[PDB]
Every structure is written in structure tokens, then in C-alpha cells.
Write a protein that binds this ligand. Structure first.
Ligand SMILES: NC(=O)c1ccc[n+]([C@@H]2O[C@H](COP(=O)([O-])OP(=O)(O)OC[C@H]3O[C@@H](n4cnc5c(N)ncnc54)[C@H](OP(=O)(O)O)[C@@H]3O)[C@@H](O)[C@H]2O)c1
Ligand SMILES: CCc1nc(N)nc(N)c1C#CCc1cc(-c2ccccc2)ccc1OC
Length: 165
């Protein structure tokens, strides 16, 4: 029924860890630059917890916060309370990025068409996980090694998968 491309944007470790203590377990400035480049000019759909950890509206993008709180407001941001409300807000958009965290990934999992996933080759301590995904009828359309240096101290790869069905 929806017309926009539903893309996931996520970075996870070897065990699907995405978060620890309501924050990111790693610091990879180069990976963040890839995120900014890939998502700029497109709506970011964020779970309420993710948004508050980010702490500010991200410029040059529609920021959409997902919450059950019908009295929730943030200046410079739009608020949605369900998948269907997000779809109404984004009905004329070309592509939207589901930006996390885990609850919001779970929520939009039945609808994802495209996966931008950074895989970090390290096993972090964590408490929040990217959901398991059946990749049947998906194909990898892009893969590239991320920049590892003194500022980016882990080995990681950018992957993009597209759903065929
Ligand atoms: N590495 C990455 O790529 C990445 C990306 C994003 C986030 N993260 C990490 O992931 C963690 C946060 O993930 P999380 O799962 O704890 O939180 P989250 O998904 O970001 O937010 C959870 C909140 O979303 C709202 N929500 C959940 N289900 C809903 C529904 N069905 N309808 C309407 N609203 C709903 C609720 O807000 P209310 O309580 O206000 O009702 C809930 O408390 C953090 O540690 C963050 O750093 C990592
Ligand atoms: C940067 C890892 C990351 N990588 C990927 N591939 N997907 C993601 N969804 C996230 C994530 C995240 C959550 C997150 C994002 C930004 C941010 C800041 C400016 C511009 C864009 C994003 C800041 C803090 C933050 O958590 C404290």
C-alpha cells in the first residue's frame, strides 16, 4: 500500500550488537561520514530512545520520532505514533531511512526493501541487538571495506542488500 522505498540504516558487530547503555559501543567517525552522505536529503525515522540519545534534530533532513506518547513534542522534528502514521507522513517521499534503534527496526521489519548495513568485525559488550533477518530473495548490491586508521580503530565493511521480491 505504501509507495516509498523503506531502507534500513544500521551498524552492528559480529553478534548483531548495536547499542550499550543507551549509546553506541564504538566510535567510528568515518562510518558516521558514510551515514551522513548516504542519508542526507532523506527522512530519518528514529525510535524515541535513539532520538534522545542523538539529542538534536539532524540538519537537512526530515526528523521523524516514533513514540507511543501522544503528548510528545520536539521543535524541528515530526512525531509519529505508529508505522501507518509514518507512512502517511512519508507518502510522497522517494526513500526513507529507518535509523533505529532495535524496537523501531523490529517495527518496520515487515516493510524493509533495502538494507544499508555496516558490519564491524569485533565482538562488543552490548544490550541492544539488530533483529535476525531471513535474506532469502535479497541480493548484495554493494560492498566496500571501511577506513581503518588511528581515528577508526576497528575493521568494518559497508554492505547494501536489495530485496528482489
Ligand atoms: N548502531 C546503530 O546502527 C544504532 C542505530 C540506532 C540506535 N542504536 C542504539 O540502540 C539503542 C536504542 O534502541 P532501543 O530499541 O532501546 O530504542 P528505540 O527503538 O530507539 O526506541 C524505543 C522507543 O520507541 C517507541 N516505540 C517502540 N515501539 C513502538 C510502537 N510500536 N509504536 C509507537 N512507538 C513505539 C517507544 O517510545 P516511547 O517510550 O516514548 O513510547 C519506545 O520506548 C541505543 O543504545 C542506541 O544507541 C544503534
Ligand atoms: C553512526 C552510527 C550508525 N551507523 C549506521 N550505519 N547506522 C546508524 N543508524 C547509526 C547510528 C546511530 C545513532 C547515533 C547517530 C548520530 C548521528 C549524528 C549525526 C548524523 C547522523 C547520525 C549520533 C549519535 C548516535 O547515537 C549516540
Amino acid at each position: 500500500h505504501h509507495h516509498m522505498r523503506v531502507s534500513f540504516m544500521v551498524a552492528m558487530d559480529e553478534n548483531r550488537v548495536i547499542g550499550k547503555d543507551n549509546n553506541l559501543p564504538w566510535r567510528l567517525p568515518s562510518e558516521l561520514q558514510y551515514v551522513k552522505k548516504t542519508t542526507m536529503g532523506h527522512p530519518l525515522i528514529m525510535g524515541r530512545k535513539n532520538y534522545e540519545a542523538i539529542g538534536r534534530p539532524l540538519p537537512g533532513r526530515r526528523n521523524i520520532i516514533v513514540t507511543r506518547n501522544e503528548g510528545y513534542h520536539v521543535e524541528g522534528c515530526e512525531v509519529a505514533h505508529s508505522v501507518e502514521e509514518v507512512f502517511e507522513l512519508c507518502k510522497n517521499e522517494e526513500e526513507i531511512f529507518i535509523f533505529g534503534g532495535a524496537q523501531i527496526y523490529d517495527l518496520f521489519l515487515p516493510y524493509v526493501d533495502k538494507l544499508y548495513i555496516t558490519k564491524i568485525h569485533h565482538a562488543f559488550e552490548g544490550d541492544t541487538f539488530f533483529p535476525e533477518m531471513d535474506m532469502t530473495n535479497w541480493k548484495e548490491v554493494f560492498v566496500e571495506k571501511g577506513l581503518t586508521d588511528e581515528k577508526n580503530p576497528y575493521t568494518y565493511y559497508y554492505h547494501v542488500y536489495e530485496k528482489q521480491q
